[PDB]
Design a binder for these strands. Structure first.
Ligand code: MG
Length: 758
RNA sequence: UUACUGCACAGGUGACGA
DNA sequence: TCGTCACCTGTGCAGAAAC
């Protein structure tokens, strides 16, 4: 019947008296806030400074004396609530403001973990993991037409390595190449200093430096990354350290699992409710009941989307709840039409790995048999092909060769392909030690570049993957097979839709930001992916080949107008037909870009048809969480006492926050990984207010379906493929732009129907 | 770079206004 | 150029595999 939030109602006065000055230049605002500090709350909005007296006595303020009604203008008290919450918790110091963020006063999980695991070390007490709370005042709509303010509670963990760098040297930990940060960030100061080159004498020598190439051991500390935590702890404890991490993980589950998180939110609400929260001397807020999403009374704030159907034929009759179950029993969506039933695949690999690579190829092509039910049949039988021919391309290269590996791979490929005729795809095997070399010598990106230039898509793989134990390998080969088939132009599966309008186009844009190191300013690139409504199905369209960030709005509009022109041509729209266009991204578009896109699409389709357009943001990092108290969870595995996904809403749960915004649950108890996996965060789906198509519940369910459309994996993706695929394209193309001899010429010729970016 | 998931850290950045 | 509300992206480690 209902979903519980992590937020509480805040009962506010109906009205507050304020003084208003015209203040066309916001530059004056800082001086005025300083001058009135203590007696007035000050807030600039729409060219006017608003003044709310908090404490009696001067200084004075001129301007009109207006009443601000909370139901009408909740932004004023929402903002004041940010400062008031801090003030109301004076013993809990702010580590951040707006939203107010602070640490647990006594809890420290490393100490508790160590005691539980039975471990000890004299330096453990300088490694700290402390619960961190934020209280976010947010405007929401308990029903359409009415706004309220709630306070939303979120929990994370502060990871911090307090230890002296001198102390870490002497304990035997190699600090070279570790990132280091300032101990005391002064007001506008950046944190990152650089990487440890050497420790001189009360001085750190730095490379990849952000400012000075050296600094005192006293002004620096290791950044609180998992990399630095694991590097230190494994040397100080290893291999007992893993037991500590499991122990630490158990501690954190005491704050982050459903029932524990729900209890922490409860205890926070109780604490905040105990006293009135002072907005001004005679003006009070009271924190109230937990905010819920329900269909009680005149509220209609929760619904459950139907299960997505994975579709394996053009009729719709062949469908499944899960991708792998469906693929196994039906074969792929395009089996009747798939042109190349005997693909030739180039296999490029270090000559010393020959035996391990043959074992992997055999498992891949011919299957693992019935002892490994995740991958019994093999690629050929799975996908309904006649055979696969491997063209073996050994490379004389060692893992220790960090400067010449890329040149050897590419020479071997060129020499093999010159006397071997046409290949339809490649598998490229890489050493782990080469995987993340700089792009000027990285074999992944150089082989990707050469083969894509030649029109040959590749599926690359690292040796640790090639060596996975059979129980794990079977799942790797599922995912590997799906992407390889799509790289060969295949369509593994589609997802259902019922035709409600005559045509529908969804376009997504995704961002990548590339640099050679953290020091170097990241350059932005974009990708564009298109998806079309089919009869019973969503179909993947063509993808961008140009990736420049400059002018991305023009690229969106060109992609849409050209595609609309071609869909109209193919489908021969009748007068009065409705066409719907949807845009997906992780950030909102500018109003002026929405206007331009609407104008151009409308002109292209013309006055014979009715057009509906929606612009949608999908957000992962926001302060909302959904709790389903009726969800008991599922056994963590067959058949333990532990549970996973306790209080996790079902996949496809959609909650109404406001007119323009829905919360979408994607990670159900089934999909949730382990007993200690936190209560998931839902996706926030936001409609651009200038959209002509207004149905955000439909748009949220559509985003859900598009998570299931990913051909990178059998499991669904974290975000709809319209965005996800675009980010992969942006990253690959932006990287390739810097690689000598790269050409995009074949991306719209031999690779036009290849899903080469998976 | 089989991937899904989670977390952490760092960098900042976007949109709306006047 | 600024106020205001908001959260994006990259990197690295570790546990699982929607029946
Ligand atoms: Mg891939």
């Amino acid at each position: 019947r209902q979903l519980v939030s992590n937020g509480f109602e805040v009962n506010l006065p109906d009205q507050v008296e304020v003084i208003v000055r015209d203040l066309p230049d916001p530059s004056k605002v800082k001086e005025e806030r300083t001058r009135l500090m203590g007696y007035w709350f000050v807030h600039w909005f729409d060219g006017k400074l608003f003044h709310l007296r908090i404490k009696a006595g001067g200084p004075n303020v001129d301007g009109e004396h207006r009443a601000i009604r909370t139901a009408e203008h909740p932004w004023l008290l929402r903002a004041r609530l940010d400062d008031a919450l801090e003030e109301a918790l004076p013993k809990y110091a702010a580590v951040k403001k707006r939203p107010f963020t602070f640490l647990a006063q006594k809890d420290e999980l490393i100490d508790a973990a160590a005691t539980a695991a039975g471990l000890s070390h004299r330096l453990l007490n300088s490694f700290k993991v402390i619960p961190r709370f934020a209280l976010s005042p947010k405007i929401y709509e308990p029903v359409d037409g009415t706004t309220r303010v709630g306070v939303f509670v979120t929990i994370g963990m502060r990871y911090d390595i307090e230890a002296s760098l001198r102390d870490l040297l002497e304990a035997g930990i190699d600090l070279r190449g570790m990132y280091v940060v300032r101990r005391k960030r002064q007001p506008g100061e950046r944190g990152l200093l650089g990487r440890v080159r050497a420790i001189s004498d009360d001085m750190v020598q730095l490379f990849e430096e952000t400012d000075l190439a050296s600094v005192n051991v006293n002004d620096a500390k290791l950044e609180g990354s998992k990399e630095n935590f694991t590097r230190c702890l494994s040397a100080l404890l290893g291999h007992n350290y893993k037991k500590l991490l499991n122990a630490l993980d158990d501690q954190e589950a005491g704050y982050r699992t459903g029932p524990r998180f729900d209890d922490a939110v409860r205890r926070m609400g109780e604490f905040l409710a105990k006293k009135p929260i002072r907005l001004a001397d005679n003006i009070n807020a009271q924190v109230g009941d937990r905010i819920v999403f329900s269909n009680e009374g005149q509220a209609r704030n929760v619904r459950l989307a139907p299960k997505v159907e994975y579709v394996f034929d053009r009729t719709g009759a062949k469908s499944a709840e899960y991708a792998w179950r469906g693929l196994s029993q039906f074969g792929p969506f395009d089996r009747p039409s798939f042109a190349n039933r005997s693909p030739r695949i180039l296999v490029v690999y270090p000559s010393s790995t020959q035996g391990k690579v043959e074992n992997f190829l055999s498992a891949f092509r011919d299957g693992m048999g019935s002892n490994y039910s995740g991958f019994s049949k093999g690629f050929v039988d799975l996908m309904g092909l006649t055979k696969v021919e491997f063209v073996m391309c050994p490379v004389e290269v060692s893992s220790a060769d960090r400067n010449g590996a890329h040149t050897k791979y590419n020479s071997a490929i060129e020499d093999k392909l010159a006397g071997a005729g046409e290949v339809h795809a490649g598998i490229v095997v890489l050493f782990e030690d080469h995987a993340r070399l700089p792009d000027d010598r990285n074999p992944y990106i150089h082989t990707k570049s050469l083969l894509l230039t030649l029109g040959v898509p590749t599926q690359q793989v690292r040796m640790p993957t090639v060596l996975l134990e059979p129980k794990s390998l079977q799942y790797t080969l599922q995912n590997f097979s799906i992407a390889t088939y799509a790289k060969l132009n295949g369509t593994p599966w589609t997802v259902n839709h019922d035709k409600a309008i005559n045509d529908e186009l969804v376009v997504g844009m995704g961002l990548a930001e590339l640099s050679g190191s953290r020091t170097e300013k990241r350059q932005r690139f974009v990708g564009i992916t298109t998806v079309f409504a089919g009869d019973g199905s969503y179909l993947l369209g063509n993808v961008s080949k140009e990736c420049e960030y400059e002018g991305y709005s023009d690229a969106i509009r060109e992609s849409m107008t050209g595609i609309l022109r071609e869909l109209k041509k193919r489908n021969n729209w009748r007068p009065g037909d409705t066409v719907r266009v949807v845009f997906h991204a992780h950030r909102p578009l500018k109003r002026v870009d929405v206007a331009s896109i609407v104008f151009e699409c409308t002109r292209e389709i013309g006055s014979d048809q009715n057009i509906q357009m929606a612009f949608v943001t999908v957000s992962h990092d926001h302060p909302f969480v959904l709790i389903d108290r009726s969800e008991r969870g599922l056994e963590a595995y067959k058949g333990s006492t532990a549970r996973k996904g306790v209080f996790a809403p079902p996949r496809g749960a959609i909650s109404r926050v406001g007119r323009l915004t829905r919360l979408l649950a994607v990670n159900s108890p089934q999909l949730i990984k382990r007993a200690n996996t936190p209560l998931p965060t839902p996706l926030l789906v936001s409609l651009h207010p200038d959209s002509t198509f207004k149905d955000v519940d439909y748009l949220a369910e559509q985003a859900l379906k598009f998570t299931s459309l990913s051909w990178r994996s059998t499991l669904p993706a974290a975000t709809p493929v319209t965005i996800f695929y675009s980010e992969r394209i942006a990253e690959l193309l932006g990287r390739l732009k810097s690689i000598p001899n790269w050409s995009s010429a074949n991306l719209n010729i031999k690779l036009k129907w290849s899903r080469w970016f998976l």
